Design a protein around this nucleic acid. Structure first.
Lengths: 133, 203, 260
RNA sequence: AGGUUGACCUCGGAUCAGGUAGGAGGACCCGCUGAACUUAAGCAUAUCAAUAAGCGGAGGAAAAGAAACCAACAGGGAUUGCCCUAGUAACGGCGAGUGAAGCGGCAACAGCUCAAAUUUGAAAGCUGGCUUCGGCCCGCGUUGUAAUUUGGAGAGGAUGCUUUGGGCGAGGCUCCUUCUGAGUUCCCUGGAACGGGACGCCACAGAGGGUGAGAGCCCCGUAUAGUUGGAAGCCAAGCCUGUGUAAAGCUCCUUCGACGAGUCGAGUAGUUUGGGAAUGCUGCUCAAAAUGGGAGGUAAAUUUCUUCUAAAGCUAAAUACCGGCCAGAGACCGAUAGCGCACAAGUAGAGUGAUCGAAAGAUGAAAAGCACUUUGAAAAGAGGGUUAAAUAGCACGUGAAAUUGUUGAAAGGGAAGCGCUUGUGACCAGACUUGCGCCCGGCGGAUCAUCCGGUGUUCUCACCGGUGCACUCCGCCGGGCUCAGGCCAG
RNA sequence: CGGGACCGAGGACCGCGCUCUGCAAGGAUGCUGGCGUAAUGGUCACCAGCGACCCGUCUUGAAACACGGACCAAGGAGUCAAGGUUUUGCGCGAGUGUUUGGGUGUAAAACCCGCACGCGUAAUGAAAGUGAACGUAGGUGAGAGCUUCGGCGCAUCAUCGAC
RNA sequence: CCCACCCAUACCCCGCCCUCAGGGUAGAAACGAUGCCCUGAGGAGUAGGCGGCCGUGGAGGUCAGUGACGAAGCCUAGGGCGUGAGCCCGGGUCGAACGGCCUCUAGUGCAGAUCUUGGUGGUAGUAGCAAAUACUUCAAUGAGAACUUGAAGGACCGAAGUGGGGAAAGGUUCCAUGUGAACAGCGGUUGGACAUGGGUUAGUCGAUCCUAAGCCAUAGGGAAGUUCCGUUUCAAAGGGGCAC
RNA sequence: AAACUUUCAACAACGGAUCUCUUGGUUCUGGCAUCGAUGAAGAACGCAGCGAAAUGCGAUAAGUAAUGUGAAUUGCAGAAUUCCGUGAAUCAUCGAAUCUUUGAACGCACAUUGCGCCCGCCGGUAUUCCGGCGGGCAUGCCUGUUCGAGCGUCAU
């Protein structure tokens, strides 16, 4: 149960904020869990997804398919994964929309910003665990 | 008797904000107490007797102590509101009982007062020393210095030997005589002038 | 809103031969022109008797009657048939009223939700907690879109003493669904008789059980009420020797033979 | 030089140096002005109403406010607001009606500044300009700028004691910032598990939302202590130094002790009030006084008494808030509802104009929004795919009724429709299928009776473990008999 | 002594009786046949015999006149507040009422606190004012209930007294 | 005057429903005691009064309630229960929620109001689609030509025009190319329609300047004020020249 | 017999009721005090590679700077991002800027893109002519400066 007066349990306000969030908030919303070996490697459960990541789909009709994240289409909350596509009537190839909560990240596109993100999340997790221990 | 013949619906006041206003008042009181710590949140008030014959049986808290009360208690009038004593200059002391009660009240407050120095490195003679600066304190002068006995005691036991004889002729007859004398004070004095003038004329 | 259905300019077209005498919106060039207004039967009109904020929302109840009802619900909570009649799973509860030692709850003993849940399972409120856990359902109606999305049953109410047991047990019991907590000096009839039905399952602490008499002695202007009936066992009263030894002979039976 | 040369006063000029005002908003606030419908049978007193409209002026509150008060008591003691006083005192055609205030309880509390005095041993005061920031000028001002005094007093004395200025400051609080627990384990249905079953885990987090169907553990968040980095303020335990040139407080006193004028008040007129004998405001006329003046709710004279001290001014809080900004909620409404507006809504559209003012939400989880073939001028049609579903085809969720088309059945000689009762045709729901008890025969087993021990109970009843050795119990299958079984009938 | 129609309520015994091994006596049993399904029963459509004005609404005594109704869907009209009065339930009871306010809170909830105040506890008079026991709180006649069977007598009514 | 016969919801007998009234029912083997058993009488109804039940939106409790193996809704010559309002089930359709019981609560029940909004009929393929004299042939285009074009004929406006140009008003309707639907009360290949583009060149033409009828500032005077009068005034309302 | 009219049923129409939904209303509660001549509110006209509106913005025009985040935007086109970075974005924050014609609206006007005046700078052969650019010119009132008027009062 929420206690803070700045927190709202209004379903209307929650849905308005979710469906009218800007791009920087949609990036945080479009997060995916890491794989197991990545979780023991980095001590990080979840990260925002981005282009160039390698994912395994764990939900839906395209389960257990793996590929590279070719697109992060934040406007309808979708990632486009390589080779997880379908054909139109004409036979042309169109990507299939996958929500990021239905995939698991198996390989990270690593740049120094991602290293700083992982390092500060790991440091925060460790200092919370030490404070509560 | 229904006074609804005006445009009454335009000034109907409800009170849905009653618990919210209680919460706001409590928050303001807590902020005032935190700002005024370690002083009490209120000022010391004198004990005064209510006007009119309906309420002159009861005492209550007044606005402030009189200048004569402060002079008799030995507190200067410029020092008094700076140490939590309310001062009223309009009220006077017409009798000794209320004056003595309020002087005793001021003396109790001054005896229980702890006065911190303005500069901690240079304490003064009228300042409370640091080894007596620590004690259990109060923060509500309305509670610690309330009206202890607002009404007179309604029951008292005396021995049968010391029962008073009372007014001769009876209390009812005494009241009737008092009313009759009050009604006839003018006519008797007028006939007193008349008898004096007659005696002076026919002496 | 007090101006709803009245933000239009409209007048009736008078008595004639074609249309009714409802006020009609003046002007032209739009669908609103000529349409009815100001009536409770009209579309886009003011309702009959619009609701006002100065309706009487709150009910003043005598404090003596509140204390009477709280005492009655407390007495009903010590009767185990009423606990089953109110839907509580108390078949494994060792004793009613259930008293737990204050050493198991005082301080930070059950400040963790796992420890509080383990204590409930140990004392036997576990089936009731599980009943509340699996009774969760989606609400039928508009309450879902007005912020009341789910319904579930009521579990145990733990009554404690804040002076002797502390207040971290509140945090320990907070996250368990249906489990409620209450100080012994602020007992709530809305919790003691949920929905007006008597027999709430209460887990007591020893400190609260000890402090209950002082709590009901400290209520100024209220005494524990005297019943109009001294012996509630009607069977014992009727079949006692004192009544039965002076009765008449029975003038018939439960079944009467048909004569003709 | 005096027919000149100046000093002042008043009034002007300047695109002079520097400033300020206007308009918007106006829910709440301070004033001015001011209705009628209504209610009085009608209706010029009245009521609506000291309201709506109109006009002027502020702020986050405004206003009011530190008694020319209330009272009549053993006296209270600035203002505001809530409860109560109280539908009371009081006012009112032909009566409909109207209607306070003192006290008391509480919320909040906070007190002061001028004019009337000679600094007269020194205008000690101040705007502006230039500065090397030391000051120096141009001026304002004696028709009065500083210090001192404001009725609570004060001024002058006497008298002996107390008081004060700066600078650091640990620490704390407010506001943004980094970070936070646990399953996507197995099976089934399903297009998709977020459903069902099993096994776990977290919980100071089982609020809310999203994700292909009801998700604490998939994601964002949620709870709690904190934990990174940054700025600006306020509070603050303490600690260093100057000391009395100056100011300030206390006690007593012979004496002195200035205190607001076309104002107060009176008459009259209008208006207003509960104050239509006791109210306030304004206009005209008259027009004060010095223990004087105001008030003391019935007119006047006389003698007393009680209370304050007008005609100058400032001031937070408790109080209001249909405007604005940020936020949290609801036993409210669920697209004819709820705001006129859930949509490119004060939009489209109408009116010369003031103004008036709508209708209109939903494919699908994902466009996967129909390739290709064929017939058509085309719109489209038919095959054939896409989908879990096209019985979802951008006329799109569900798809009622009025009304219409086809198919099937039927009736109909100037109405149909309805009630009772048959009949015909069409179409249906039940009921029934066998149960129970004996007598034989054949199988499969010993949870038959008694006894012993343990346990529980209703304290005499049961269960459990050994005992049955098959003429005793329990099931199954073949035969026979009795009884009860459905519908219509004699 | 025949002939016919319609009906069979109840569900161990008890009773009144008689023509008394039993019975026609406080309500139907016995025997037999066909069929065991659309056969009985039911629904819809239609024909037939008989029956049967179109609804509100208004008017007065009533009709007639008059007025509204092409059809269907969705709205659509004795509500809320304040103050009385009678009755019902509840708490307390010569008292009663926490919620203006304060404390407290898991925070518009619940729980706790008390001064004043409202109503009641005394009335009457324009007012000044005064202010309710002769008596087991009276006598007489009724009066439920109780009684030691002599009476005691609730509520309430009539009547004479008292303050 | 006599005999027989017909039938009313009237009278008699029996069954069943409701109402009312009168009885019974505990040392309870005992009961939705708010129940059951026994007996008798009665049954129309406007205004009006009272009681009980059915239904709808929402709230507390509860049913360890139903549900993608299909909730709600809708259709049904398909059935069951109730005197009834209604309740329940079968079948089809459909796609995400909903119900029973006890209390609480209300914006809670429609045939009418010449209602309100929306939708749809008969009339009915009906009334009309008849002022302004009038059209015809060949070819082309095109799926399609009375109302497109070219040619060929016939006519009309008749110089106060059915001509050539402007003022007001409109605002792109002007020109070229293309065009499915809609509109052009038929038809359309055409269009002032729809789609994309293009087009308006000034020292001399107008505006701009002048003043007319008139209107508005300033000085100043009214008005609580929004503002009214005032336009030459009861205004210090400015131009030029010269200078050893 | 058919047709026609009417009744019943199935399917298909017409129409948009019902049910479920809800980035919206409505009511209550809490917090805050901040428009404008340093030019407001409002109005008009413009600005995107491809927009009419809504949205955002002002010739620095669906935008600039700065801080933060850290890899998009998306309907098409076209470019990205040294991804180990002075850095995508219709991102967030927001302290620096830009801010057309107007409007209390301010040179005089305005039914005109009309008519002026003062002072600088630049260009065209230019002491004279022509053109462009920049800074200014409302009213009432206050304080001060300076220039004045008047036998109004005086001195000399």
């Amino acid at each position: 149960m929420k206690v803070r007066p700045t927190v709202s349990s209004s379903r209307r306000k929650a849905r308005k904020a979710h469906f009218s969030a800007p791009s920087s908030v949609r990036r945080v919303i479009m997060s995916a869990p890491l794989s197991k070996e990545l979780r023991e490697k980095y001590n990080v459960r979840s990260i925002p997804i981005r282009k160039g990541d390698e994912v395994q789909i764990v939900r839906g009709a395209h389960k257990d398919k793996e590929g590279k994240v070719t697109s992060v289409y934040r406007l309808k909350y979708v990632i486009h994964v390589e080779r997880v596509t379908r054909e139109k009537a004409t036979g042309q190839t169109v990507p299939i929309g996958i929500h990021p909560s239905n995939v698991v990240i198996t390989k990270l596109h690593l740049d120094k910003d991602r290293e700083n993100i992982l390092a500060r999340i790991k440091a925060g997790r460790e200092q919370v665990a030490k404070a509560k221990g | 008797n229904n006074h609804f013949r005006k445009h009454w619906q335009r000034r109907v006041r409800c009170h849905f904000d009653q618990p919210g206003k209680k919460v706001t008042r409590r928050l303001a009181r807590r902020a005032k107490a935190a700002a005024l710590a370690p002083r009490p949140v209120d000022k010391l008030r004198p004990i005064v007797r209510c006007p009119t014959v309906k309420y002159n049986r009861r005492t209550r808290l007044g606005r402030g102590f009189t200048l004569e009360e402060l002079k008799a208690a030995g507190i200067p009038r410029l020092l008094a509101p700076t140490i939590g004593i309310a001062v009223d200059h309009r009220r006077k002391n017409l009798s000794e009982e209320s004056l003595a009660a309020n002087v005793q009240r001021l003396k109790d407050y001054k005896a229980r007062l702890i006065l911190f120095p303005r500069k901690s490195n240079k304490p003064k003679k009228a300042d409370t020393p640091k080894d007596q600066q620590t004690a259990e304190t109060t923060t509500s002068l309305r509670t610690s210095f309330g009206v202890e006995q607002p009404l007179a005691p309604g029951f008292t036991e005396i021995s049968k030997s010391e029962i008073p004889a009372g007014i001769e002729g009876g209390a009812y007859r005494a009241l009737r005589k008092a009313r009759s004398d009050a009604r006839l004070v003018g006519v008797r004095e007028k006939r007193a002038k008349e008898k004096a003038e007659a005696e002076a004329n026919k002496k | 809103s007090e101006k709803a259905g009245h933000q239009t300019s409209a007048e009736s077209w008078g008595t004639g031969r074609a249309v009714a005498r409802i006020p009609r919106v003046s002007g032209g060039g739009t669908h609103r022109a000529g349409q009815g207004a100001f009536g409770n039967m009209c579309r886009s009109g003011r309702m009959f008797a619009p609701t006002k904020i100065w309706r009487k929302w709150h009910v003043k109840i005598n404090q003596g009657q509140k204390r009477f009802a709280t005492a009655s619900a407390l007495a009903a909570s010590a009767v185990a048939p009423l606990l089953m009649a109110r839907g509580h799973q108390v078949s494994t509860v060792p004793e009613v009223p259930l008293v737990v030692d204050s050493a198991a709850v005082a301080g930070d003993a059950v400040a963790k939700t796992a420890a509080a849940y383990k204590l409930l399972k140990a004392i036997g409120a576990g089936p009731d907690v599980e009943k509340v856990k699996k009774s969760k359902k989606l609400r039928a109606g508009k309450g879902k879109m007005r912020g009341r999305r789910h319904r579930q049953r009521r579990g145990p109410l733990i009554v404690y003493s804040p002076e002797h047991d502390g207040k971290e047990l509140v945090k320990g019991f907070r996250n368990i669904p249906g489990v409620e907590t209450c100080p012994v000096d602020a007992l709530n009839l809305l919790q003691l008789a949920p929905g007006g039905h008597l027999g709430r399952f209460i887990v007591w602490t020893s400190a609260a059980i000890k402090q209950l008499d002082a709590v009901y002695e400290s209520k100024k202007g209220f005494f524990l009420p005297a019943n109009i009936v001294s012996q509630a066992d009607l069977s014992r009263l009727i079949n006692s020797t004192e009544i039965q030894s002076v009765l008449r002979a029975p003038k018939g039976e439960a079944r009467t033979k048909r004569a003709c």
